[PDB]
Design a protein around this ligand. Structure first.
Ligand SMILES: [Mg+2]
Length: 61
């Protein structure tokens, strides 16, 4: 199997939550969506996506 991790989001969660990388990876692996570390990881990725979409719309629409 192959698992993809967003390294930048992982680093940001670890810095902001003062936690180990394995703590984040564990809740992702266990699909424990309710763990705030998982929520934060996906929030960082989702917001990056949304901001990229908004910037595009601002400049081109
Ligand atoms: Mg405008």
């Amino acid at each position: 199997s192959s698992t993809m991790i967003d390294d930048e989001a992982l680093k940001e969660v670890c810095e902001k939550f003062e936690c180990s990388e394995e703590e984040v990876l564990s809740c992702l692996y266990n699909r424990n969506h309710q763990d705030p570390l998982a929520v934060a990881y996906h929030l960082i990725i989702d917001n990056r996506r949304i901001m990229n979409e908004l910037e595009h719309h601002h400049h081109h629409h």
